[PDB]
Amino acid sequence: TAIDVTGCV
Amino acid sequence: PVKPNYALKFTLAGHTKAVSSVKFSPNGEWLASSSADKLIKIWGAYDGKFEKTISGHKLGISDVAWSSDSNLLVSASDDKTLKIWDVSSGKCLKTLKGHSNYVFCCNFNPQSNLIVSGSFDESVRIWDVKTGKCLKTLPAHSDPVSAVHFNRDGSLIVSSSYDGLCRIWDTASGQCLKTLIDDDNPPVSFVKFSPNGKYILAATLDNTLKLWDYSKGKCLKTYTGHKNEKYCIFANFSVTGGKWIVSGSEDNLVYIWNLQTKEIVQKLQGHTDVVISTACHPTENIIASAALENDKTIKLWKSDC
Ligand SMILES: [Cl-]
Ligand SMILES: [Cl-]
Structure with missing residues (x-):
């Protein structure tokens, strides 16, 4: 499960 | 990038007791350290050069x-x-x-x-x-x-x-x-x-x-x-290169994990006591680590990713 910790998509 | 290649670049010595915290300035230029010695110290983020001591607390400092x-x-x-x-x-x-x-x-x-x-x-x-x-x-x-x-x-x-x-x-x-x-x-x-x-x-x-x-x-x-x-022990997100989790450890090492897979990708040896604090530079692949009473140092580590 890949997560994005810097962007807010 | 499956693994970083952090290598020790600089040792920031001068605190006379346990270091409690290290933080990079948001503009990447400086590092600030706190210690049980009642002092704040300021250092160059890129060369580890000592800049100044800030005194005035009556007892040890835990955080800056x-x-x-x-x-x-x-x-x-x-x-x-x-x-x-x-x-x-x-x-x-x-x-x-x-x-x-x-x-x-x-x-x-x-x-x-x-x-x-x-x-x-x-x-x-x-x-x-x-x-x-x-x-x-x-x-x-x-x-x-x-x-x-x-x-x-x-x-x-x-x-x-x-x-x-x-x-x-x-x-x-x-x-x-x-x-x-x-x-x-x-x-x-x-x-x-x-x-x-x-x-x-x-x-x-x-x-x-x-x-x-x-x-x-x-x-x-x-x-x-x-x-x-x-x-x-202070942990961090590393997001300048590969996406890592960084932390100190009571076996005197810095641990780096893959953010996604949660696998350990690197252990950094050099501290002689508990690594109480880590920080990640805002733009460069640079980790600061700080250790307790039997070490008294901050270390700067640099990676190509
Ligand atoms: Cl210096
Ligand atoms: Cl902790």
């Missing part, structure tokens, strides 16, 4: 934090004060009085008009930077407050405590919006929001890092293999 403009520092001391410093002049601008026991953790909000503090008095205080006045005292926890952090728009504070809880606070109202726990109850020794504010990274004193999607109330990832049963 920068303002977003890389000009102000706040420190948290066993003397039960925070101090706001002008780093370029060395001057103490304000002393924040009100905690009844050791101040252990501090941060500015991103706007840097507020400071949040946590104490062995089990409270969280929110302070006006301009006036130094305490705006709110929260009855946040039932044991010492180990960490406090604002989210990226300043609307939320996360706190952690030896009581076993992570709590999310409305900055404006001071109301507790959420308590996070996963059915285990070891002390919580650290907590911070991810850069986007969507996740919280917490450390518990049973050798575990825990990453929460706090809006879903769900723990999505853990990072394990390190030693952390005693001390409040």
